[PDB]
Structure formats: structure tokens, C-alpha cells
Amino acid sequence: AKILEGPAMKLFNKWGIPVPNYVVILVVKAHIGQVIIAEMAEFYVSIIGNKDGAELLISKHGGVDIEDNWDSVRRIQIELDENPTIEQLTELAKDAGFEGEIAERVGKICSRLILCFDNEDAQSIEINPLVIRKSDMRFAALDAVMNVDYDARFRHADWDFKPVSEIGRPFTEAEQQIMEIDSRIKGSVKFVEVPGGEIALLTAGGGASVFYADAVVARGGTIANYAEYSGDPADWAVEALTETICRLPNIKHIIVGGAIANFTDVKATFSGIINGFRESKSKGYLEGVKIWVRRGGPNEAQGLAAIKQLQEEGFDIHVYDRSMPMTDIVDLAMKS
């Protein structure tokens, strides 16, 4: 979970990491609804987590010139809960090219970074540049790129921040509405709008959703959205998700797919889908659109029978069972 410049700096501050004085409401960058203003040799420091702990990469060639100067980078592997001493870090600095007084200083900074990483549940922290003002020996972390493990938030009461958006652009109304629904529920509901796209996905489980999207792209098609629902979510949340998908512009087919559920009740979830299809059809949204259903899971007979009844209500709905290979409804949809 990528976090903003301000928050990152706050944690740096907390673990005593040289940071320029900043204010969130001289330089002027944006976090548009928020702007940051901070006072303005260069080095590179980054700590990137791995299966065995983390790796600390250090370079004397900081700033933009680090791309070609990747041989200058000295890296050490910090084994989980076996954090190096200041001297080791000083030696690490020394290997890079740091001499006497600064090496220790760099080493000391590194430890703090290491403490910050260990204690803040970070995935990675990247400082480029870590600048030095030789006149008085003052250091400052100019560009702070921090990723924290947001699932860990319950251990951190000082985390008065939210993580940055996965896709570069922040979320729309429908999107934020679906994220609100998910936070409140024990199950999971995810919705991402893809600009344009003729084929709308309403698929169960993250793994199956990804295979259905791949199938569409591979078959030449265009995805209208990315939608996942898993962990036996509440019908209303599923109905909320169905409704959102139907509201989508210029959609030709609906892919109501999924694998064979292990615990998600297909009758409950299909009732939420049915209710949302009925709600959307009365509002005039599902005119001409063909619905493609392929599903398995607890109470699949009852839910599949309930969804095939939607044929007598005038819906162009094709419903298949497990015998139909999972992503092969995408072919049947492409052919139409």
C-alpha cells in the first residue's frame, strides 16, 4: 500500500530520519484537493522487503544519475529480526565509498530506516535523494517513496492516513460506493471501471475474475469492467454490485461467471444478482443485452434454476453448469 509523501515523512520523523520541514494544506507539490510545501551531495537509500527479511541498497550516486550508476549500489540482506549493528552499516557505507565521519552518519541513518521498516510493517522505503549539507553536516530525505502493509493497521493507532489508489487515477462514485460496501461486510466486493468495453464481468472470486478478463482480451474482446465478489458476501452487497454493472455504458454481454464455490452459497448470491437484474431491467438498463451464466458451488441447483427462470421475464439469459468449461462462455459471447 503506497502512502503519500506527508505520512511517509511523519514516520521518518517518528524514527528520527532527517526530513525537510514540510506542511500539508520552498517547493510546492500536490498529494487535486491537497498540496504539500517543503523547504528546498545526493545519495540513494532503499530497504525492500523479501521472503527472508529485507535488503538495504545504498549508493553514493544519488538523484537522477542512479539509472546508469547501478554498479555503485552496495546491497546487504537483513535477515528477519537479525538487524545489523551500526558498525556493519558504517562498513556497508564504507564499501559504497563513504569516508570517516559521513560513513558513520550514513550508517546511523540506515539503522533508523531499518528500525522504521521493522516497526512500521513496511513493504519498502525508497529515499532518492538523501541529501547532505556538508557546511554543518545536516542530512535530509528529499523524495520519500514508502509502501506499508495496510492489513497491519490494527497494530498501528498512529496511522491516521489511507493508502494511494492502485490505478494512477483516484476512484469514481460507483467505485468508492463498492469499497464502502466491502469494508462494512465480512465478504468481499470489488469494482473497477474500464474506459469503454463491450463485455461486462460479474464474476465470483479474484482468481476466476482474472481468468475471465484474460479470456476476453485473448478472444479479441474489450472488458467493460473488473468485478469480483467472494467469501460468501451478503446478497444486498451482490445486488449493489449487479446494479452498478448494469448501469455501465454501451455494454453488449454480461459475464456472470465463476469457478465451483467451496463455501459461497450460489442460491443466496444468485438471488442478489437476480434482484439487481430485475431492478436494472425495470429501469430500462438491460435492453438487448445478453446475460451469460456459468457457475458451481453450494446450492448451485437452486440458484441456477432461479437464474434460468429469468428467461420467462424476457431476459436473453444463457445459463450453463460445471460441464461448460469455465471461461468458454466468453467464446459463446464473442461469437454472438
Binding site: 529480526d81 513493504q123 490505478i167 476466476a208 479470456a215 485473448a218 464455490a261 458451481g296 471461461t327
Partner: protein, 589 residues
């Protein structure tokens, strides 16, 4: 099979999610005809309780322990732990399980387990030489042998995927929902699975793909492995490295999610290319996976590694619930009770066939609901007006009377209202308020057997029942009349069309009894008893009017003592006559 087998005995550490896992595991244990896998539950909130788990039609009681130490002490048999706790507690429970010398395998379903915690647990499992599956793992399924978790879904799915016997295919997925799809694909296009393992979708799983592939390579039953991965990490790259490194006996079939390289190092094209180059069967889409399984299965038949031995098994079916069998009329259930007065099964109760809210809307009252529930007939305006007055006039008669005093005593002893009122209601009987029914019976019998013979009736009563029910009062007398009875009598005689032979008779015996003792007045019990007998109300219902009415008073007194903040009553010494035995020494035994 690879991790779970007929020797696996589990402890489920978790609550309701754990119990649902155990119920699913019990369905598998019934199908493959093995003893229950779950031996115990560890859940401090429910410590000491027992969970009812059905193994087919047989109920099994599984004990809930406060901690793992007493669970393993009572069940040394346990070698597996399943963690069904939330993120904040899962890692500590997993640590406790890994540190237990009995536990060899720990599997976690938990989602949102901090990466730092999963990394620490992987390190601990390695030090101790134990297996850690998950976090975010739906479970481990060994066809015909063991099910750990909800993996495999409904009972019908276990049968469709032939999970009651070993096949030739191993299943490795990150995704839970996709292990069930893979199991089906192996049953549909191959001969079924050996073991299916969901490794979890977390950044740092406890055990990766290669760890499991090594185990499958050593399992003689597994001839091929269906591995379902996705973009992120290098778990599939390392598996391609494992396959290329040495000549492997097992064939690897792999599908990688994330080829959305047209929409916005660990790439699904880079993973598909590494595996394809390593010699794995990699389809272009998930749909091609069924074709890759059919390819490998046909090679195995041709190469004589699989035998075409037909499914020679008469499988057990899940017993229906009693209600299902009843609906079909295939079982006889003799009811425990029969009710004739109300039906609660609809949107609202129906009292004697009438909807409770429909009675409110159409302007009926409490007195009309009394008649419906006690006579099964809507009262007439006349009847309704008498019921209303009987209830109002009997509602309370001060705090000195047994019923009211019982409620006051309980109210002061700090007892809650329903329980305090029940103590006062216990006092209603032959001497206080509960002579309504008998007054009705004996006065009706007097009218029939002694019409012009009150001394005969009285002689018969003295000899056979004792005091006449409905006659006598402790404070009311001829010199101190009970205006409650004068009011009711004048209402019935002057404001209604009712002919009252019982009441007429009772009023005549009052003239005779009060001539003997002035306090032998016709009381409220006798008055209500006769009025209701003359209205032809069921005899059983007669005491209901006092019991219901005096409940208004009894709740009143309870509220009053509570509003006063009354202290406990301990009866004053000077009011007790201790007519006790002389004090004496106890003799030695």
C-alpha cells in the same frame, strides 16, 4: 496423497468459522467412511462447551478447550492444527501450534495476516522442521483420505469430483475457488485428484509451489500436477526452475492468471514462458486446461501408468432433515403438543382465526382479545362490557393481600418484575382470589340440585367441601360492604339483558350466611364466578379473570417499590411468635 491422510487428526483453533469447517470435514469423513478428523476445538470465548457435529446421521460431540495444552493433553492423537481466527490473533495461535511437539502441520484460512507475521511463522516452521500452509488457504484435500478445511464444497461436489477415491492428479493453486475448479477438471478430463493444496494468495506463503512439487514427486500415486498461479512474486518461476533442474517423474500442467498486459519481472507472460521452456503443459487460456489434462491422462493410459478400473463403489448419501422426510410424508412425527387458540407461523399472530392487527384497526379492545384467546369466539358488545368491568374492578386491592404482598416482598428482595409477579401469582388459590371457578361450579350445582333449598346446599357444602367458595372476607362485612360486588351486581341487573340464575342464588345464600357471621358476604370471587357461569363461559377460564386482573395490581406494586428504592424486608421480631422447642444439647452419634 501428500500432507493429509487417514492418520491426520486435527484441532480447530477458531470459532463459528472453525465449526463450519469441522461440519464439512465430518461430511467427507462420512463419505470415505473414516473416523472424525476434528478431535477438539480451541476457543477461549466458548471454553467448556461442546459442539454437535454430524458424521452423516450420527451426532458427535466435540469439546471446546481454553488453550492448546489441555486439548493435546486430552487428545495426544492430534497432529494438525487449523487456524480459523482473525488476523489479530491468528499468528499467535499459529506460533503456539508450531511450538507444540505433537503438531506437524499448521494450516491458516485467515486473510489480512501481516507479512511480517507470516515471514516470522515461516522461519519458525523451518527451525522446528514443521509444515505451515497459508495464510489465506482454503485447505488441503486428499481424495479418499482426508479433508482439512471447507475445500471441495457441498457433498454433491465431493461425489462429482470423485473425492471418495485417489486419482492420478495433484492440484496446487494460490486461489481457493480455483482449487475446486481444478479438482473438477481432473475428475471430468482425467481420473480425479490425489491431493489438492491451496497455498494461499498472500505475498509470503508458509510453503511455496516447489515445496509441494517435491512432495508430489515422491508420491507414487501422483503422475501429474495441475498448478494454477498468477502475476506477482516468483513462486511459479521457482517451480519452472525446479522442473528444469532435474528429470521429473511428474508432468506439470500450468495456467497463469494476469495476461491483462493490454490493460492497466513477475509477469504472467514471463511465468508462462519460464514454465513452457521448462517442459510444462501451459494452455493459452484457462479453457485449454481441460484439453491439457485429457492429453496427459491419455498418455498415462497408453504408457500403462493408469488402469481403467471402473468406480466399483456403492456410495453413502447424506441423511435428510426430519422436516424434508415429513413434507414427503415418509416419516411419522407425533407432535409434542397440540394448540387450538393461536397461530404465530404467519406475518402476525392469528387469535382464534383473526389477525391481531386487523382487530386493532377495526376498533376491538383488550377485552375482545381475552374472549378470543379464552373462548375462541369474538365476544358480543354486552359480554365485552362485562369482561372490561371485571378486569378493572379486580385490578388491585391494596398491598396487604397475599398476591400483592408476595410481589412487594420479591420487589424488595431485588427480583426482576416477571419473577416477582410470578411469586405473587403463586398466592392465587383457594383462599385468595382463586375461588372463581369453584364458586361458579358449586353455585351452578346449587341452582340445579337445591333450587329452593339453601340450608340443604349449605349442609351438603359443610359436610363435603368445607367453606363455601365465594363466601367470606377478612375485612369486608355487612357493616363494611364491598362496593366492588355491589357495583358489578347493579351493572348486570340494571344495565344488561342477562338472566343470572347463579348470581340470584348466590345473593340469597349471602342473606343466610351473613345472618350466621357478618363477614360471610358474597365476595368478588363468588360474584365474578356466578356472572361468568351465567354468561356460559368455559368453567376452566373462570379464574383467568382474577389472575389476569390482579397481575395489573401486582406489576403496579413492583413498580412502586422500585420507584421508592425499597430495601429488603426482614419481618420485625415483635411480630413473630417463636413457639420453639426448648434448647437442648445434641447427643453424640
Amino acid at each position: 496423497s501428500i500432507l493429509a491422510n487417514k492418520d491426520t487428526r486435527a484441532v480447530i483453533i477458531g470459532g463459528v468459522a472453525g465449526v463450519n469447517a469441522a461440519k464439512r470435514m465430518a461430511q467427507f469423513d462420512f463419505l470415505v467412511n473414516r473416523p472424525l478428523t476434528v478431535q477438539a476445538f480451541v476457543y477461549p470465548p466458548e471454553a467448556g462447551q461442546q459442539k454437535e457435529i454430524f458424521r452423516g446421521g450420527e451426532l458427535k460431540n466435540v469439546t471446546v478447550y481454553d488453550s492448546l495444552a489441555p486439548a493435546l493433553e486430552e487428545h495426544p492423537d492430534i497432529n494438525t492444527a487449523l487456524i480459523y481466527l482473525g488476523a489479530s490473533r491468528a499468528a499467535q495461535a499459529a506460533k503456539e501450534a508450531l511450538e507444540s511437539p505433537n503438531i506437524q502441520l499448521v494450516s491458516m484460512i485467515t486473510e489480512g495476516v501481516p507479512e511480517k507475521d507470516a515471514k516470522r511463522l515461516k522461519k519458525l516452521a523451518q527451525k522446528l522442521g514443521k509444515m505451515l500452509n497459508g495464510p489465506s488457504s482454503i485447505g488441503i484435500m486428499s481424495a479418499g483420505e482426508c479433508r482439512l478445511g471447507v475445500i471441495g464444497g457441498e457433498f454433491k461436489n465431493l461425489k462429482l469430483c470423485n473425492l471418495y477415491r485417489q486419482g492420478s492428479f495433484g492440484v496446487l493453486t494460490k486461489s481457493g475457488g480455483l482449487s475446486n475448479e481444478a479438482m473438477w477438471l481432473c475428475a471430468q478430463n482425467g481420473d480425479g485428484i490425489t491431493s489438492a493444496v491451496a497455498i494461499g494468495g498472500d505475498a509470503y506463503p508458509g510453503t511455496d509451489f516447489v515445496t509441494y512439487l517435491e512432495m508430489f514427486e515422491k508420491d507414487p500415486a501422483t503422475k501429474a500436477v495441475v498448478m494454477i498461479g498468477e502475476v506477482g512474486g516468483n513462486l511459479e518461476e521457482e517451480a519452472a526452475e525446479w522442473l528444469a533442474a532435474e528429470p521429473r517423474r511428474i508432468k506439470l500442467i500450468a495456467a497463469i492468471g494476469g495476461t491483462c498486459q493490454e490493460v492497466l519481472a513477475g509477469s504472467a507472460r514471463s511465468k508462462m514462458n519460464a514454465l513452457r521452456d521448462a517442459g510444462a503443459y501451459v494452455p493459452d487460456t484457462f479453457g485449454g486446461l481441460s484439453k491439457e489434462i485429457k492429453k496427459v491422462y491419455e498418455e498415462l493410459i497408453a504408457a500403462g501408468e493408469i488402469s481403467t478400473e471402473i468406480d466399483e463403489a456403492v456410495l453413502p448419501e447424506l441423511p435428510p432433515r426430519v422436516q424434508e422426510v415429513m413434507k414427503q410424508g415418509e416419516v411419522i412425527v407425533e407432535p409434542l403438543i397440540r394448540t387450538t387458540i393461536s397461530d404465530d407461523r404467519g406475518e402476525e399472530p392469528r387469535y382464534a382465526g383473526y389477525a391481531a392487527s386487523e382487530l386493532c384497526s377495526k376498533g376491538y379492545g383488550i377485552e375482545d382479545v381475552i374472549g378470543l384467546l379464552w373462548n375462541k369466539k369474538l365476544p358480543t358488545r354486552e359480554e365485552s362490557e362485562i369482561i372490561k368491568r371485571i378486569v378493572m374492578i379486580s385490578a388491585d386491592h391494596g398491598p396487604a393481600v397475599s398476591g400483592a404482598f408476595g410481589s412487594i416482598l420479591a420487589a424488595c428482595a431485588g427480583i426482576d418484575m416477571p419473577q416477582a409477579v410470578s411469586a405473587g401469582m403463586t398466592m392465587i388459590g383457594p383462599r385468595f382470589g382463586g375461588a372463581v371457578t369453584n364458586a361458579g361450579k358449586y353455585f351452578k350445582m346449587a341452582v340445579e340440585d337445591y333450587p329452593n333449598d339453601i340450608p340443604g346446599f349449605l349442609s351438603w357444602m359443610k359436610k363435603n367441601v368445607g367453606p363455601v367458595p365465594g363466601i367470606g372476607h377478612r375485612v369486608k362485612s355487612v357493616k363494611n360492604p364491598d362496593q366492588r360486588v355491589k357495583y358489578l351486581v347493579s351493572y348486570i341487573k340494571n344495565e344488561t339483558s342477562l338472566h343470572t340464575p347463579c348470581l340470584d342464588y348466590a345473593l340469597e345464600v349471602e342473606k343466610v350466611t351473613t345472618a350466621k357471621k357478618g363477614n360471610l358476604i358474597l365476595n368478588v370471587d363468588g360474584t365474578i364466578g356466578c356472572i361468568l357461569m351465567d354468561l356460559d363461559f368455559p368453567v376452566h377460564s373462570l379464574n383467568g379473570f382474577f389472575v389476569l386482573a390482579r397481575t395489573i395490581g401486582m406489576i403496579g406494586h413492583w413498580i412502586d417499590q422500585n420507584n421508592q428504592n425499597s430495601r429488603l424486608i426482614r419481618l420485625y421480631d415483635y411480630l413473630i411468635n417463636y413457639a420453639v422447642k426448648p434448647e437442648q444439647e445434641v447427643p453424640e452419634k
